[PDB]
Ligand binder design. Structure first.
Ligand SMILES: NC(=O)c1cc[n+](CCCn2ccnc2/C=N/O)cc1
Ligand SMILES: NC(=O)c1cc[n+](CCCn2ccnc2/C=N/O)cc1
Lengths: 540, 540
């Protein structure tokens, strides 16, 4: 009843809201504070737990979005603005949301925790495509999603100093995980069956938590969608993070005039600046000749990450852990319209040979000219080295393999070979309502709406097949959250999803057709990135 | 009583609104349609007059802003967003506004007509800084302002063809001028005493009307604020206009693969595209290595402009015309934060010598290496060739002189020497409420709020001296509109404003201090741009 919309947690009382789905109602608790507002002197600091409150906190609507850059490449366009903030920006943003079935579960229920992506510079738990009402109604699981500080506010780092240690955006997620341990039982959720799942930078975050011992105790399973902590964009060195942080200070006038520039005076100067001012110079801090490179990302400090993600994945024991990994068919196409020459969402992006050669330097930055030739002469079809359509898909493969598919395949192989049960997929269905052009195929990010069951929304023009497809995927994700195995615990009639192993390298394709097993997550291309290219880079 | 808010014009009846000023009320008629909506098959075509309507058109609020790019360089910033659209974007935007004193004048009154700036790619008559309620109350004049199509919708040109003839944005302004001839009498205005005044691209527009015979009959005096038709940014050649238009068609997928590319099929394809799609690719049409260069500007076709503005100004007889021209102290500083390396509004923009040498390439983009050297070695202080503060102001002088001050001084000299009475000014007061940084001084466009008397708004924190100053400036502009002479028609107490002649080159400084006469509008620098540099291009 209306009594199930009232819940007490360790910090105080909450009033939720009843959400409707075509299959029945759901109880949602949107906007639960899990940390003290990280403002004024607490900007750039690790989060402090929210102190208990008197009265009833209203938990009926999403709270503020953390301060972030707002994408303006295509104003008024659905394909880009669906990721933009849909609540007002504020540094007061450390809130989490909880969906729970109606009636509330009597017995402890497995908990899904969502970590949004957005390159560590954007994103929000309030986005329409992260609506948890459909996954909770159809699979009677408990869904939690948190906000975490992005951009400079979450990942500006002057390593060594205590005024700006870095990775505070990861600590925000960790605190939200500690909050789930201490309070998800009150919503009917099992704190012993917690399944993290994220996408892009959210998936990378999930991977960073697997490799951080303090976070490792707060969950039991992991799902990484189109991202990995070992990606070339997901981390940064201490020296580069200090250079970026210092350059941002310079751009906003820090330190003032002629004055000392130790870490303490620099952060104090940064704390006096309005939040929007720091955001307005976020992209100017990089060399600014890049697609896929982000200014403030997790730093390898020796604290949250004792070593690089690659090192920790190799030297890591993963027995007793189940992972679900995967990518979309066309991982790189969405990013090409963000700086690759000759590309535009409003034409066919039939690029020339010279544009392809320049795009490789944009999509694979920082590498040497000989390394670029290895990429070009490996992704060229030499029977059609000038076909524009093939060059377009080649560059899309170049930036997709280098940034997503091969970092993911590298990780999935090391996990399976080191004792973790791993299941791998490739998402190959292009939504019928997709607004991006046809040549992008199944772009990065556009499986999320099917995992969250958005096709079930009656106010959307999804086909009957996509509705059944969405229910199928929700069953896969929920079964993995419940049992660690996406396969039906009692249904062998439907095609089976074999584990992924370093040898067989099996995965399944997710589309309207029944499950189909394949071998190799682009094994040929990924051997070039994972094996040959590092040996080639030790020429300088 | 309230019967003065109802007025009949040639097309039908209108209901206006009474606006309040601290000195008394004013009658405003906001949103008068003067053309048929240029939508669908009419896009890119010259405007057609608004056909008469039945009933009473509501004229109590500003109408839609013409489709245009929206500046996002500093989100949430007062200094940039005061120029952004403050009404909904639409192609249905050919509307004009009329302010008139209360009580309505019984004898014919001089008419001021405002043409907004915005580089021919943006701007709107509805901006708060253009509100004529204070100018009309204080000086009992009649103020008119129109919207004209900007960007591709106003200035896309495939010269020779009739599907996209070009300069249709200038024809929108002309139609609004024909409208003032036929209807301003109904508001108490004298159609024989019409003074055009504009700023930046608006000032350039005013100048192109002086040089177009069909427009010359529609007004009697001109005011040009920080702009001129002979500026290097204000016009474009036929060949370049065709190349730019074709590039925009390619970016939006026109024509579809395999279709012929004649002008008819190209424009037909462009007309099917949504307006926002064309706007989203406007800047991608240039080489895109330019501060101060705009994609779609008036073309020199032989129709609206029988020759280049430079030729028409030289070969022109300007007897019987009074012109008021001028500039602000720091014309170029506004534009450096829009692409000049090392510049940011949030620090002191202390640029290096290398950044200065690179910025000259951005501020003067069309030149050769040798021409750039002549610029660098002319604007360098050779006793302090590395002082960043001086280099900063040197680049501001480079950009300001090349784009505004010297094209204006060129025009003002030719006009006075060829029979026009000319008055020249330099605006030297930096508003106390200015939000741009101090190092920008008096940036481009920040005299407008004083000409329009915005300091009189009680909801603003302007000083008492700026209020008196704004009233003084309104008297100058109004006196010029009535008599052709900014000086008080019978008051020799105040210092007097001498005409500007090709020899004495006298102008006045407008600031809180009384008028002060000076000689030379950057005469030394402008000899370099107007006389010497054309001679080094001649070494092709
Ligand atoms: N203000 C700027 O100049 C700016 C440049 C690049 N970006 C890139 C962000 C968009 N993006 C979306 C997905 N991946 C990216 C990264 N491209 O580099 C944003 C802003
Ligand atoms: N989308 C873009 O990357 C973009 C580039 C340049 N501009 C030019 C800004 C307009 N402007 C304002 C004052 N001066 C200028 C002209 N700059 O060339 C706008 C947008």
């Amino acid at each position: 009843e209306d009594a199930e919309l009232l819940v007490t947690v360790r910090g105080g009382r909450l009033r939720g809201i009843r959400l409707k789905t075509p299959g029945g109602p759901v109880s949602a608790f949107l906007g639960i504070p899990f940390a003290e507002p990280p403002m004024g002197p607490r900007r750039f600091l690790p989060p402090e737990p929210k102190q208990p409150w008197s009265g009833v906190v209203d938990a009926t609507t999403f709270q503020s979005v953390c301060y972030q850059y707002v994408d303006t490449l295509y104003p008024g366009f659905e394909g880009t603005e669906m990721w933009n903030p849909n609540r007002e920006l504020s540094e007061d943003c450390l809130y989490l949301n909880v969906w729970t079935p109606y009636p509330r579960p009597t017995s402890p229920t497995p908990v899904l925790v969502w970590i949004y992506g957005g390159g560590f510079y954007s994103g929000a738990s309030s986005l329409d495509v992260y609506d948890g009402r459909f996954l909770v109604q159809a699979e009677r699981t408990v869904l939690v999603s948190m906000n975490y500080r992005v951009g400079a506010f979450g990942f500006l780092a002057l390593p060594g100093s205590r005024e700006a240690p870095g990775n505070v955006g990861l600590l925000d997620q960790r605190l939200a995980l500690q909050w789930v341990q201490e309070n998800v039982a009150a919503f009917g959720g099992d704190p012993t069956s917690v399944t993290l799942f994220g996408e892009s930078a959210g998936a990378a975050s999930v991977g960073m938590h697997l490799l951080s011992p303090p976070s490792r105790g707060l969950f039991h399973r992991a799902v990484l969608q189109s991202g990995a902590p070992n990606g070339p964009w997901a981390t940064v060195g201490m020296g580069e993070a200090r250079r970026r942080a210092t350059q941002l200070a310079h751009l906003v006038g820090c330190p003032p005039g002629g004055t000392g520039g130790n870490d303490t005076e620099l952060v104090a100067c940064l704390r006096t600046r309005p939040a929007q001012v720091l955001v307005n110079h976020e992209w100017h801090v990089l060399p600014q000749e890049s697609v896929f490179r982000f200014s403030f990302v997790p730093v390898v400090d020796g604290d949250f990450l004792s070593d690089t993600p690659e090192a920790l994945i190799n030297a890591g024991d993963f027995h007793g852990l189940q992972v679900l990994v995967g990518v979309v068919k066309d991982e790189g196409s969405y990013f090409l319209v963000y700086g690759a020459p000759g590309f535009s969402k409003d034409n066919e992006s039939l690029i020339s040979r010279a544009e392809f050669l320049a795009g490789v330097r944009v999509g694979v930055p920082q590498v040497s000219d000989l390394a670029a030739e290895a990429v070009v002469l490996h992704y060229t079809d030499w029977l059609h080295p000038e076909d524009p359509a093939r060059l377009r898909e080649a560059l899309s493969d170049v930036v997709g393999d280098h940034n997503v598919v091969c970092p993911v395949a590298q990780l999935a192989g090391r996990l399976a070979a080191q004792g973790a049960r791993v299941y791998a997929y490739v998402f190959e269905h292009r939504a019928s309502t997709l607004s991006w052009p046809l040549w992008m195929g199944v772009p990065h990010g556009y499986e999320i709406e099917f995992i969250f069951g958005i096709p079930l929304d009656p106010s959307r023009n999804y086909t009957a097949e996509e509705k059944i497809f969405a229910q199928r995927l929700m069953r896969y994700w929920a079964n993995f959250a419940r049992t660690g195995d996406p396969n039906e615990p009692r249904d062998p009639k439907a095609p089976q999803w074999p584990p992924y192993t370093a040898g067989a390298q099996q995965y399944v394709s997710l589309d309207l057709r029944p499950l189909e097993v394949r071998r190799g997550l682009r094994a040929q291309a990924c051997a070039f990135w994972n094996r040959f290219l590092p040996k080639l880079l030790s020429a300088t």
